[model samples]
Target chain A: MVKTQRVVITPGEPAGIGPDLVVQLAQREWPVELVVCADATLLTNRAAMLGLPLTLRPYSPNSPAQPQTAGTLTLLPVALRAPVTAGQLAVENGHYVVETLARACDGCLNGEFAALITGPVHKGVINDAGIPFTGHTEFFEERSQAKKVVMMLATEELRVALATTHLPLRDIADAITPALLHEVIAILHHDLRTKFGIAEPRILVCGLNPHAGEGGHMGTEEIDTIIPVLNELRAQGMKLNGPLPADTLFQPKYLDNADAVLAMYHDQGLPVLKYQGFGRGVNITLGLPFIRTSVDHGTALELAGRGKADVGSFITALNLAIKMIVNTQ
Target chain B: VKTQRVVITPGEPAGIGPDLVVQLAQREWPVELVVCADATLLTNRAAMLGLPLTLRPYSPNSPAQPQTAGTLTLLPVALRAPVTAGQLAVENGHYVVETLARACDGCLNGEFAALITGPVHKGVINDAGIPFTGHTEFFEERSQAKKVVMMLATEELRVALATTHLPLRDIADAITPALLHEVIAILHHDLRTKFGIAEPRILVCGLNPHAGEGGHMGTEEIDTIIPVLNELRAQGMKLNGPLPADTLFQPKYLDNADAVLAMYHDQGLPVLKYQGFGRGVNITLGLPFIRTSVDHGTALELAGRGKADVGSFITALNLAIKMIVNTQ
Candidate 1:
C-alpha cells in the first residue's frame, strides 16, 4: 500500500495576515493533509475573528496522514511569545515566525512532509527582534545547506527564475560567472523536470543589458559569460533560449512556447512578471533539497485581520505546493 | 492661418518607412502632413500598395492646412540611387539624414509645429561614413539642446529613461547627481510644456536593485538618488520615488503617476514594452522642437509587401498632433 502523503505550511508571521489567511484556507477540503507549523492558540483566535470554523487536530508523525477536511487542519504547534493584535507587529513574536518556518522545514527534510508552503513574512519585524535574517529563501538556503538556490516567481502562464537573487545592482554583473550560470541552470533544469514533471522545459533567458549588449555596444556580460555558459549547456542537450533582450522576450510571441524565463537580476525580470501576476503570483524557491513555494507578496501589515485582504496569492502558493507534492511523488 | 504643418521623415528609402507613410496618407488628419523625402518614393510605395496618393509641393511661404485623405505635402529631398523594396543601398544613406535635417530645420524655424520620424537604418548611415548614434542624439546636437530625455509611451503608460543605451555594468556609475537633475528638469518641463500636465508627478526608479533597499543593497539611492530627488522637490516639482523599479510598475502607483523615470534603459523598457510594444511610440524631450517616432525598427523583409501594420506609425503621427495641440 502507498503511504499517505502530507504537505507542511508555515503561516509566516502571527501579527500579519498569515494566520488570518491560514484560517480562511481551512474552510476548503484538500486532497492531502495540511500540517500548519504555527501557534494553535493563534490559529483558533484568528479563525474566530475571521468567522471561520476551524478544528485543530494535533499532528503526529506516528499517526497515519489523512486528507484535510473542511473546517479543520492538522496542527504542529509552535508557541508564540505574545498574543497578536491584528495588523500590529510585536517584536517579541518575531522569534515565533522563524521557529515555525524551521519546524516546517525540518518536517520536510525528515521525509514527514512531501512539500512546504510559506505565507508572507514581515522582514522588518523579524530584523527588529535582533535576528540577522535576509529573507525566507535565504533562511531555507542556509538551513538546508544547499550549494545554490534560484529565486523564481510564477503566475499561471509564466515562470521567471533569477540568476542572482536580491543583490545590489552594481554587484549583479560581477556575481554572474560561468560556474554560477552552470549551477543555476542545472538546478532550474533539474527541478523543472522532477518537481514540475516536464519532460523538456524551454526557458527563455534575459541578457544583462538593454539589447543583449547590442553587439557589446551596451554591456559585455552577455557576450562574455552568458553566451559561453549557454553554449556549454546547449551542448549537453539543455533547451535554453537567450540572452535575448528582456524588452522583447516578455512578449506573447516568445512566451507562448517557453516553460520558464531566467533573468540576470531582480528588476529586469520581476517588473513585468509582477505586473502580469496582479498580486496572484507565487514565489517559488528552486534548487532546494525539499520543494518550497511562497506567496509572491509580503506581510501586508495593514491588512492583517481586515478580512478584505485578497487571499489569491496565498491560495496560489498553497495550491502550487500541492501540485509539486503530487509531481514529486 | 493654422500652424499645423507637422514635418515627417520617411527614414530609409528601401524599408517599410516609406510604405507606412504612404498608407498613412490614406486617412485625413488634423494637421498638414508634410513628407520630407523624395516625393517619388512616397508615390512609388503607394502604387505598390495599391493605395491612393496625391502629393503637393511644400513651401515655407505656403499656409498650413489640415491634411486630406490620399494627400501629403512633399518637402522634396532627393535620393542618391534608385531604390528597391526590401533591399538596403549604402548610396541612399545620405538621403535619410538629409530628410531628417530638413524636417528638424523646419521645426526650429516654426514652419512645422512638430516632427514625426520613421525608423532609420543606423548601419547603412554609419556605413556611409556618417556619425549617427541615433535620432535622439542627432536632434539634440543639431538643435543645440543641452540635454534630451527619451520616453516611450502607450495609451496607458509613459516611461522616461534617465540614462539610455549604456551597458548594464556602467549604468550605476553613469547615473550621477547632475544627470538626474538634468533629466528630471527636462522631463518635468516637457510634461508641462508638451503634455500640458499642470503638476507632473514623476516616479523615479533607483539605480540599485530594490532602490538599494535603504543602503543594504547599494548606496547609490541614498547617496545619489535621494538627495537629487529632494533637490528637485525643493523647486516645487511633484516627484515620488527612488522606488524599486520592480514595484513601481504596479497599478496602484502607476495610476496616479504622470510618468516613471527609470535610472537606466533596461530597468524601464522591458516592462514598458512588455506592457505595450507595437502600440507604443518614442517621444524625445528637451529638444527645442517637439519630436516623436515609432518605437520599432525598419522591417526590411516586410518592405512594400503591403503587410506592414501602420499602428505604431499612426500612433506616432497622432501623438505629434496631440503634443502640438497641447503646446498651443
Candidate 2:
C-alpha cells in the first residue's frame, strides 16, 4: 500500500486566527491527516472563542490520532505564553512562533509528512519572537537546507513565476543575473513538468521594462540580462520564448497559449496573477522536495471568528496540494 | 465655431489587414471626419478584394466628397515598386509605406487636423525601411520634442502605468530612480484628473521582486525609491504608503482602486492595455497639441483583407479629442 499522505499545518501565531481557520477548514472528509504545530491552549481557547469544538491531540508520528469530526481538529500543541486573548497580540510569544515552525520542519523531515500547508503568521509576532524570521519562504529555505527555490502564484487562468522576490525597485536589476535566470528557469521548467504535469510547458518570460524596454529605449535588463540567459537556455533545447513585453503577456491570447510565465521581478508577476485570483490564489513553492502550498493572503484579524474568513485561498492551497500529490505520485 | 477635428489613421505594415477594415469603418457616420493614411492603390485594391467599393477622394479634408456612396476612402497614396499581392511581402518600398504618416503628421502640424488614429505597423517593415522605427510612441516622441511621458493601458476596470520600458531583468533595479517615481506619479495624477475625473489620485506602486525582498532579500529600492520621493514631494502626506506587494493589487475591487496604478515596468503596464483593446487600442500621446489614437496590431498582407480591424478605438480617439477641445 502507498504511504499515507500526512500534512503539517503550521499554527503560525498563537494569538492570531491560524488555529481558528485551520479548525474551520480541516473537516472530516479529507483523506489526508493534518497535524497542527502550535500550543494546546492556543488552539483550545481560539476554538472556544470561535464557537468551534475541536479535539486536541499530543502529536505522535507513530499511530497518529485521526481528526474526530468536521468540527473536531487535531492539534500538535506547541504551547503559547499567557493564553492568547481574542484579537490581541503578545510580544512574548515570538519564540513559540519560531519553535512551532521548527517542530513542523522536524516533522516534515524524517519521512513523517508528505506536504506542508502553512497558515498566515504575523511578521511583528515573528520578529518579536526574537528569532529574526523574515517569512515562510525564507524560513523554509533555511530549514530544508535547500539550495534554491522559486515562488509561484497560481489562479485558474494564469500561473506566474518570479525570478526575483521582495527586493526594492532599485535593486531588481542586480538581482536579475544570467546565472540566477538559468537557475530559476531550470527549476521552473523542472517543476512545471514534474509537479504540474505540463508537457512541453509553453513558458512565457516577461521583460523588465514597459515594452520589454522597447528595444533598450527604456531599459536593457531584457537585452543584457533576461534575454541572453533565455537564449542560452533555449539553445540547450528548453521550450521557452520571450523577453516578451510584460503587458502583452496579460492579454487573453498570450495567456491562453502560455503554460507558465516567468516574470523578471516580484511586482511584475504578482499584480497580474493577483488581479486574476485575489483570495483564491495559491502560493506554491516550486523545487521543494515535498509539495508545499499556502494561502496568498495574510492572517486578517478582523476577519477572525466571524465565519467571515475567506477560505477560498486556503481551500485552493489545500486542494492544489492534493491534486499535485495524485498527479506526481 | 468649434475647431474642425481631423482624424488621421496610420495603417502600419503590409501583412496585417489594416487597410481593408479601416476603409470599411470610414464609411460610417462619425462625430468627426476621418482621414486614413495608406497607399492609394493598396486601399483601393483591399476594398476590391473584399468586394467592397469605396469612393476615392483626393482631399478628404475639404467639404463634400458627395456623401460617401459606398466605403468613402481618403487616399494619401504611396506608389509601390510593383503591384501588391495578398500575404506576399515586397520587402522593399518600406519607407514608401510610411509616406501616408508623413503627410498626416504634416496635416496635424499645419492645423489641418485635430486628432490622429493609426494602424499597426510591423517592427520588421520599420526595420526594412531602415528608419529604426519600433513603435508609434517613439515616432511621435521625436515629432513632439517631448521626453519623459507616462504610458498606460485602460479598460473599464483598471489602468496600469510603468516606471521602465524595455530593459533586462537584472537591470530593472537601476531604472527606479526617485525622480522616475515622481514623474510616473505626476503623469498618472494628471491623467486621473483629465481622463477619469478623479480628484485625488491614488497610484498603487509595485515592488521590483517576488516578495519585495522581505525588506532585505533584494535591494532597498522600495525603502529607498518610493518613500523617499513621496516624503519629499508629498511633504509628510499620509497618502503615500510603502511599496505594497503586487499580489494585493489584483481583482476588480483593488483594480477599480483610486484612479491608476504606477506599475514598475512594461510587463505590468502592457498586459492590461493590450488585453482590453487588441487591434483597437489607443496610444494617447499625453501632452500633445491634439489627442491621437492608433490600432495596436501590426500590418499584415493577409490581415489587410479581413474585418479584424476594430474601428471603435479610432472612434473613441476622435470623440475624446472633440470632448477635450469642447471642454477647453
Candidate 3:
C-alpha cells in the first residue's frame, strides 16, 4: 500500500493575515496534500476577500492522500467560536485560533500528517479568551509532552538557536548555566542528525559576553560556564567551535562549515539572522516528536484585508517542513 | 588648504600594529601620516617586513605634503627600551602613552588635522604604573571632551554603541535616560558636523531583544528607551526606533536611516564586523578632533610576520582624511 505524504497547516488568528496567507498558499500546486486545520468558512471568506478562487475539500482521514492541486485545499474543519472580520480582532475567536493549532498538532502525533507548519497567532486575544497562552512553542510542547525544545530561526544562509530565549538582559548570565546548554545542544544535535540527516553535525556556539569575555575581563560566563561545557561536549565527540565572539561568529569564514549557531540570547543571534533573511526567515522548533516550522513574523493585523501580506515566509516555512519530512524518511 | 597632516599612532610596538603601519607606507596617500612613535621602530619594522621606508622629521615650519610611497613623515617620540618582536615590556609603556599625548596635542592645537590610532594594550599600559583605561577614554581625558560616542562603520553601514565593553549583567543598569541623552546628542552632533550629514536619521535599538516585546520581556524599553526616543524625535532629529535589534538591521530599515545606535556592544558590532570584516574602522564621535581607529586588536604573534591584514588601518586612515575634508 502506497501512503501519500500529508502536511498540516494551522493558519492562526483568523482575523490576522494568517488566513490570507493560507489562501495565498492555495494559489500553487504542492507535492504533498495541503491539509489546513482551520474553519472552512473563514478560509472561503478570506479567499473571496483576496479575489482568489479557492476550492476546499473536507479532509477524510481514511481515504488515501493525493497531491495538493492548485487553488484547492484539503480542509480539516475546526469550528470558530464567533465570526471573524479581516483587520478587526475579536476576543471570542481566540480559541478558534488555538483550536486550529491543537487539531494540527494532534494530526501529526496520530500519524495523520507528515509535518505541521504554523502561522503567527495573536497571543493577546488568545489570553483574553481565557486561554493562558505564552506562545505556540509552549502550547505544542505541553501537548506533546516534550521536556525541552530549541527555538531556531533559519534562512537559506544561516540557522541560529538561542541558549536562553526570553529574560531580562540582566538575568541572562544567571540563566545560562551548563545544564541549560546541555539540554539545548542535545536537542539541537539530535535533531540535526535524525531529522536534518547530517551524519555528524558541526555547531558554532557564541560567547555569553562580548569578545567572549576577553579572558574573563568583560565577563566570566564564558570562562566559568561556557568553556567547561564546550570541553565536556567536545570530549563526547560533538563538533563545536566556540566561545567565539558574538560579533565575529556570524561571518562567512566561521559560518561556512557551521551547520548551526547556538547563541546565548535573542538580540545576539536574531538581529543578524533577520537582517540576512530579509523577510523570508523560518522559525523551527527542534526536539519535538514531530517536525514543526513557522513564519518568523507576528500577526500583521493591518495588512490582512489588503491582500498585501507577503507569502515568502509562509512558503519557506511549508517548504522547510516538507524538506524535513523528506529528510527524516 | 588642499591637504592636512594626519597623525598615526601604532599602539603596541610588540604587536602587528607597527607591521600594518609599515605595510600602508608602501602606497602613496592623499594626506601626510605624521606617525608619532619611535623612528627606529618604524625603520626596524619596515626592514623586517622587507618594505622600503624613508622618515622625514616633522617640523611645524614645513608645509604638509601628500604622502608618497616608501616615505613616512615622522613626529618621533623616543622609546624607553629597544624593541623585540612579539615581546612586551613594562619599561616601554610610557613611550606608547607619550606618542598619543604628542599626536593628541597636535590635533587639539590645530598642528595636525586628525588623529588615527592603532591598537594599544591597556593592561600593559596600566601595569607600568601609568594608569590607562582605553583609547577612547585616554583621548576623552586628554582632549577634555565632555562626552564621546563609540561608532564602528564599514563602507555600507555605521553603528554607534550606547554602551561598550560592559559585562552582560551590567549592561542593563547602564541604559538610563541620561546616558541615552548624552550618547544620542553626541551621535547627532557629530554626524552633521564631522560627517557632513545634515538632519541625520538615526536608528536606535532597544536594550532588550525584540526591543523588550512591548514590556513583556523587559521594561527598559518602555520605561527608558521609548520616552527618550520620543523626546529626541520631537527635536527635529529623524530618529526611527527603539525598534527590535533583530528587526532594525534589515535593508528595509537600514537603507532609510543614516546610522544605527545599538544599546550594547554585541548587539551592534557582530553584524558590522561580519558585514565588513578586515575593512571596519572605529570612529569616536564628540571629540574635538577627527579621530578614527582600527576596530581590531594588536596581534602580537603576527608582529613581525608581515602576515597582518592592513584593511582596517587603511580604512581608518582614509576615513580620517575624508573627515578632515568634511570638517572643512
Candidate 4:
C-alpha cells in the first residue's frame, strides 16, 4: 500500500475572512490532500461570491488521499447552525466555528490527517455563543491534554517564541519565573528538534528587562530568574545564547545564526516580526501531539466576503503545515 | 554681521568620540566650527589619522569667522592625561565633562549658535568618581531646565521618549500625568521652534502592549496615558495616539505624522535605531540653546583606528547647523 499525506484545514469564523481565504486558496494545486473541515455550503457560496470556482467533494476514510486538484477541495463536512451571509456576522454560527475546530483537531489526533492548518477566528463571537474560548493555542492545549505548549510566530526570515503571551506589560515581569521559563524553554527546544527536524537548535534568549535589566540596574528578573533558569538548561547540553538586551538582539548579525529567539513577552517579539513580515506570517503551536499552524492575524470581519482580504498568511500557513508533515515523516 | 560659531565637544578622550571630531573637521563647514578639547590632543590625533589640522585660538573678540577646510578654532580645555587609541584612560574623565561645560556655556552666552557633541563613555566617567548619569542629564542640570525631552531623528523618523533610561518594571509607575504633559509640551514646542514643524502631528505610543488592549491588558493607558493626552488635546495641540506600539511604527501611520512619542526607552528606541542605525542624531528638546549629539555610544574598541563610521557625527553637525540657520 502506498502511504499518502493528508492535512486538515479549519476555516474559522464563517462570517470573517477565514472562509474567503480558504476558498481563494482552492484555485491552486497543493502537494498534500487538502481536507477542509467547514460547512460545505459556506465554502461554495464564498467561492461563488469571490468569483472563483470551487468544487467540494465529500471526504472519505477509505479512499487514498491525493494532491488537491486546482479549483477542487476534499472536504470533511461540518454542519452550520445557520446560513451565513458573506459580510455579516451571526452569533448563532459561533458553535459551528468551534465544531469545525473540534472535528479537524480530532482528525489530526486520530492519525486521519497528517497536520491541521487553521484560519482566523473571532473570540468575541465564540464567547457570545456561550462557550468560553481564550484563543486557538489555549483551545488545543486543553483538547490535546498537553501540560504546556509554546506559542511561536514565524516569517521566512525569523522565528520568535514567547515565554509569556497576552498579559499586561506590568504583569510580564512577575510571570517570568524559573519554573515557567524551564518548561517553556524545554518545549521550544523539543519541538525544534522533533517537529522542525533540526538535530540541534541554537536558541537566542532575550532579557526580561531593558538591556536585560542592565545588570540589575533596570530590573532584576534577568539576574534572579532568567539567568538561573538558562544556566540550568545549559548544563543539560542545550545550545543557548542570551539574557542579551532585547533592543540589540534583533539585529542581523545575531539573528542570522539564531534558530529561534525566545522573547519574554508579546510586545518585545511580535512588533519586530509583524514589522518585517506584515501579511506573510504564520503561528505554530509546539509541544502538541499533532502539527498545527495558523494565520497570525485575527478574524478580520470587515474584510470578509468582499474578496478584499489577502491570502498570503493562509497560503503560508498551509504550506508550513505541509512542510512540518513532511519533516516529521 | 558676526558669523555664528558652533561648538563641537568630543566626549570621551579614550573612545572614538575624539576621532570622529577630528575626521569631521577635515572638511569646511557652513559656520565657524569651534573645537572644545585639548588642542594638543586634536593635533596629535589628526597626525595619527594622517589628517592635518591648523588649530587657531577661539578669540570671542575676532571678526565673523568663516571656517576653511583643514582648520578648526580651538577653545581648548586641557586633558587630564595623554591618550592612545582604544585605551580607556579613567584619569581623563574630568576632561570629558569639562569640554561639555565649556561648550554649553558658550552656546548659552551666545558665543556659539549650537553645540554638537560626540559619544561619551558613561561607565568610564562614573568610574572616574564623578557624579554623572548621561549627557542629557548633565546638560539639563547645567542649564537649570525644568524638563528636557530626548528626541532622536533620522532622515525620516523622529522618536521622543516620555521616560528614558528607567527600568522596565518602573515604567508603569513613572508615567504620571505631569510628566506626560511636560514631555509632550516640550516636544510640541520644540518641533515648531527648533525642527521647523508647523503644527506638528505627534503620534503617541502606549505604555502597554496593544495599548493595554482597551483596559483588559493593563490600566496605565486608561488611567495615565489617555487622560494626559486628552488634556493636551484640549489645549489645541495636534496629537494622534496612545495607539499600540507594535502597530504605530509602520509606514501607513508614520508617514502621516510629524514624530512619535514612545512611553519609554526600549519600546521606542529599538524600533527607531533599527530603522536608522548609523545615521541617527540625538536632539535635546526644551533646552535653552540648540543641542544635538551622536545617537551612538563611545566605541572603546574602535577608537583611534580610523575605522569608526562618522555618519552619525556628520548628521548631528548638519542638523545643528540647519537648526541654527532656522533660528537665525
Candidate 5:
C-alpha cells in the first residue's frame, strides 16, 4: 500500500490577503491532506468575513493522511501574536509571519510534510519589526542551510530562472563572477534533474550584456565570464544552449526546445513572463530539500476580505507543487 | 488634383532590400511611389522575381500621381557594377549611398512628402571605405537634425528608445537630465508635427528595474529621471511614467499609451520585437522630414531569391503613407 503524504501551507502575512487567499482556496477539495501552518483563528475569521464556511481540525503526525474536503482544512495552528483586521498591516505581528514560515520549513525538513506552498508576505512590515528579512527565497535559503538556490518563475508555457535576483542593474555586471556562474548553473542543473525529473535538463542562458555584449563591442562579461563557465559546464556532460541575446532568446524558434531559460538578472526574463501569464504564473524555489512553489504576485492587501481576488496563480502554484511532489516521490 | 509622392531608398545592393521593394511594387499604392535606384537593377530584379514592371523617369515638373500595378516611377541613380543575387560587392556601396542622398534631398526639398527606406548593409558600405554607421545616424547627420529618436512600431505597440546602441554598463551614466530633455522634446515635437498626434501621451521607462524600487535598487530614477519628467511636465508636455520597465509593457499600460519611451535599447525593444516580430516598422522621429524604414537588418543571404518576407517593408510603406496623409 502506498503511504499517504501531507503538504504544509503558510499564509505569509496575516493582515494582508494571504489569509483570505487560503480561506478561499479551502472551498475546494485537495488530493493530499492540506495542512495550513497559520493561526487557526485567522483562517476562521477570514473565512467568515468572506462568507465562506470553514471547519478547522488539529493536525497529528500519527493520524493517516486524507484528502481535504470543501470548506474544511487541517490546521497545524501556529498562533498569531495579535488578531488581524482586513487590509491593515501591523508591525507587531511580523514575528508571527516569520514564525509560520519557520514551522512550515521544520515540518518539511523533518519528513512530516511532502512539500510547502506559500502566500505573499509584507516585506516592509517584517523589516519594521526590527528583523532583517529580504524575501521568502532568502529566508528559505538560510533556514535550509542550502549553499545556493535558484529562483524560477513559470507560466503554462515557459519557465525563466534568474542568475541574479533583486540586484541593481549597475551592480549586476560585477555580481556575475565566474565562480558565481559555476555554482548557480550547477544548482540549476541539479534541481532540474532531481526536483523536476528531467533526465537531462536543456538550459538556455541569457548574456549579461545587450546582444550578449555584441561580441565584446558592448560588454565583455559574456565573452570573458559567461562563455567560459558555460563551456566548462558543457564539458562535464551538462547540456547548455547560450549566452544568447536576451531579446532573441525569448522568441518561439529558440524557446520551443529550451526546457528552462536562465536569465542574468530580474528585469530581463520577468517582464516577458509576467506579460505572457499575468495572473497565472508560479514561482518555484529549486535546490530546496523539499518541494516548494509560490504565487507570482504580492499580498494585494486591497483585495482582502473581498471575493474579487483572482485565485488563478494560487491554484496554479498548488497544482504545480503537487506535480513536483509526485515527481520527487 | 495631383497627389504627393513618397520616395523609396533601397539601401544595400547585395541584400533583400531590393527584393522586398520589388515585391511590394507588385501591388498598386494610393500615393505616387518613387524608387531611387539604378533603373537597370530594378528591371533586372523585377525579371528575376518573375514579376511584371514598368519604370518611369521621375520629373519634378510632372504632376504627382498614384502608383499603378506593374509600374514604378524611378529617380535613377546609376550602379557602378552589374548585380548578382545573394552576393556583396564593395563597388556598389557608392550606389546605395547615392540613392539615400537623392531620396533624402527630395524629402528635404519637398519633392517627396515622405521617405520609405529599405535595409542597408553597414559592413559592405564601410568595406567600400565609406564612414557609415546606421540609417538613423546617417539620416540624423544628413538632415543636420540636432537630435532624432528611433522608434519601432507594430500594429499594436510603439516603443521609442531613449538610448540606442550603447553598452549595457554605459547606459546608466548615458541617461542624464539634459539628454532626456532633448530626446523627449524632439519626440514630442515630431509626434505633433509629423505623426499628427496632438498632445501625444508618451510613457517613459526608468533606467533601473522597478524604477529603482524607490532608490533601494538604484538612485538614477530619484536623481535624474523623476526630476527630468517633472520638469518636462511643468513645460506642458504630456508624459506618464518613470514606471518599472517590466510592468510598463503590459496591456493595461500599453493599451492607453500612444508610445513608450524606453531608457535603453534591450529594455524596450526585446518585448516590442517579440510581440511584433516580422511585422514591425522602424520610424525616425524628430526628423525635419518624414522617414520610416523596415524593422529588420539587410538579409544578405536571402537577397534576390524572391523568398524574403516583404511584410515589414509593406508595413513601413503603409505607415509612411499614413504619416504623409496625417501631416497634410
Candidate 6:
C-alpha cells in the first residue's frame, strides 16, 4: 500500500523568498514528508544568504522517499532565468516556476502528493518569462480541468468567499447568475464541512447594493439574483442568511460568529480581511483534487533584502495546509 | 433680547414613550422653553398611564405669553385621527404629526427657536392617512428649501454619510456629481470644524467601484470621477485622499480623525452607520438656516405604555443643538 503525504510547491522564481522559506522549512520538522519540485542551487543560495546550515541529498529518480532531517533539505532542483539574486524577479526563472508547478500538479494526479502549499510569484516576471500565467488559481484550474473552484480569503476574524473575482464593477451584476450563486455556495458549503471540518457552517451573505437595496431602492441584483439562491439553498438545508449589508456584516459581533461570509465581490471581502489579518491570512482555492493554499500577497521587491520581509502570511498558509491535511484524513 | 431656543417636537399619539418622555422633560428646568406638540387629552392620558404628576396648559396659542413653569406645558395641538391607544397607528391622527412638524419648522424659520429636535413618527400611520412621508430629513428639506445637506449618523466609533437618501440600487450612480462631491466635502468640513471639530480634517473619499476599479479591472469612474476632484481639492490645500476602500474606512481610529468623508453613493456608506449606531446616533443637516438634529428612530406603536424607549437619543439631539448654539 502507498503511504500518504502532503506536497509543497514553490510557485515562482528561484531568486524569490520561495527558496529562503523552503530552506527554512528544512530547519523545522513536521509529522509528514514535504515534497518540493525545484532546483538545488535555489535552496543552496538561500541557505548561504542566511548562514543557515543545511544540505540537500538528491534522491535517485526511482527511489521511494522518506521524511527530511534537520539541516538537510529535499531539493528537486529546477534551474533559473539568469544568475539569481535574493528578492529579484528574472525572466529566465519564470519558465522554471511554470515547470515546477506542472510537475507538482502531475504529482498530485499520480497520487504522489496529497496537497500543495505554494509560495508567492511575480506576475511581471512570469509574463516576462514568456508564459501567460494570470495567477496560480487560474493556472491550476486550466491545468487540472477543474470547474467551479470557489476563492476563499480567510483570517481569524472572518472567512469570505467571493461570488465574483477580478471582474469590472459594471459587469458584476451580469456575472451573478442563479446557477453560479448556487454552485459557489454549494462548493463553499461542502468544503467548509469536509476540508476545514467546520460544523454547521453559518455563512453570512452580503447584498449587492447599499442596505441590501433598502427594499429595492439601491439595486435589483440582490432582489433578483442573491435572494433567490439564498432562499432556495436554505430550503435545501444549507444554512445561509443575508443579502444583508456588507457594512453591517463586518461588525465585530457579526464577524465573531460567522463561520464564513459570502461577499458579492473582491472589494466586499479583501479589504476587511487584509486589514484585520495584515500579515496572517491565506488564500485558499476550494474544489481542487488536491489541497492548495497560497500566501495572500504579491511579490514586493522593496522589502526583499532589508530582512524586513514578512513571512507571517506565508507561515499561515503553511500551517493551514498542514491542518487541512490532518483534518481531511 | 428674548432668546428663542430648540423646540422639541414629541411625535405620534398612539406611542406612549414619546409623550411620557416629553412629560419627563417638563419636570426639569432649562435655559430654553419646553414646547410639547400633542393634544392636551393625550398628555393627560400619558400622565395617567405613567402615573406621573403632569399638568397640561390649554395650548401654546391659548396661553401665548404664559410664564415658563414645570407644570404648564406649551401644547402645539395636532388633530387626532382615532381614539388613542398604544402600539397601533391611527389614520385619523396621522395628519396631526405633520402639523406638529409644520409648527416646529415655522418656529425655526421665525427665529422663535434656534434649532429643532424631533420625536419619532410612524410612517405606516402617515401612509395609511394618505400622507406618504419618507423621513424627517425629507420633510425638513421640502420645508426649509435647503437642497443639499449631509445626513451624518454618528456614534462614538464611526460617522457615515449617504449620498443618496433612499433609492433603488441601480439609481445610486445618478446621485454622484462634482457639485454633490463639493457640497458633501464642504458640509462635512464645516461640521467637523463647527462641532466635534478638528483643525486639519482628514476626509476619506470612497470611489464608486471597488477602489475605483483597482485602476480599471472594474470602473474608470474612479479615474474620471473621484481622483480628479480629490486631486483638485488636495491641490487647493484640502487634506483628502483619492478614495480609500469603503469597507476599510471604518472603526474609531480612522473615523474619529476624519473630518469629512465622501462616499460616491449608498453602497459606500449605509453599512457603517447601520452597524455602528442604529438608534444610538443623531442626524444633523449642514447648511440649514437654523441648526437641526433629530432622534434616529421611528415611533413604533408596538412598545406602547412601556418606558423601554430610552429617551437618551433625544437628549443627545437636544445636546447637539445647544452645543451648536454655544459654539456659534
- Model 5 spans with C-alpha error above 4 angstroms: none
How many pairs of residues collide in model 4?
0
TM-score, candidate number 1: 0.96
Docking quality category of candidate 3 according to DockQ thresholds: medium
Candidate 6, A124-168: lDDT as tens digits: 677777898767888887888888788888877368788887665
Once model 2 is optimally superposed onto the true structure by TM-score, how far is the C-alpha of residue A107 displaced, in angstroms?
0.8
Which candidate's lDDT is highest? 3
lDDT of 6: 0.61
Sorted into a CAPRI-style docking class, model 4 comes out as medium
Give the winner by TM-score: 1 or 6: 1
Q: After superposition, how far is residue A290 of candidate 2 from its true place, in Å?
A: 1.9
Model 5 C-alpha lDDT per residue in residues A74-181, reported as the tens digit of each score: 999887888788889988889999999999999999999999999999888998999898889999999999998889999974998998887777888888999889
Backbone Cα, N, C clashes tallied per candidate: 1, 53, 2, 0, 0, 18
lDDT of 6 by residue, B1-328 (tens): 2333444454555554455444445444343444555556445655555634444453334323323433434545655555454545556445545655665565546534433444455555566664545445545555664444544544433343435544333433543566456655555555554464545444555444345534545354454555545655664535445454533454433554544444433344444444444444444545343444454443455434555444554555455554455455
Residue pairs in candidate 4 whose N, alpha carbon or C atoms collide under 3 angstroms: none
TM-score of candidate 2 on Cα atoms, chains taken together: 0.80
User: For residues A1-329, what per-residue lDDT tens digits would candidate 2 score against the true structure?
Assistant: 56657677885766556767787775545767677777777766676776767775555667854533465555677767665665677788777778877887777666676678888888876676677877888888788887788999998847889887765555667777888888889999988889888877778888777677777777767777777888898888887868787766676667778888898777667766776666789999887777888988777766666566666787788778877876577
Ranking, TM-score, top scorer first: 3, 5, 1, 4, 2, 6
TM-score of chain A considered alone, across all candidate predictions = 0.97, 0.93, 0.98, 0.98, 0.98, 0.92
Local error of candidate 6 at residue A196 (angstroms): 2.1
Q: List the residue pairs that clash in candidate 3.
A: A247-B270, A271-B246
Write one digit per residue (lDDT tens) for candidate 3, span A113-204: 98999988998899899999888888998999999888999998489998888777877988989899999999989998898888899999
Higher-lDDT candidate among 2 and 4?
4
The runs of at least 3 residues in candidate 1 whose Cα sits more than 4 Å from the true structure, single-residue gaps closed, are A1-4, B1-3, B59-62, B86-91
Q: Provide the DockQ value for model 3.
A: 0.76
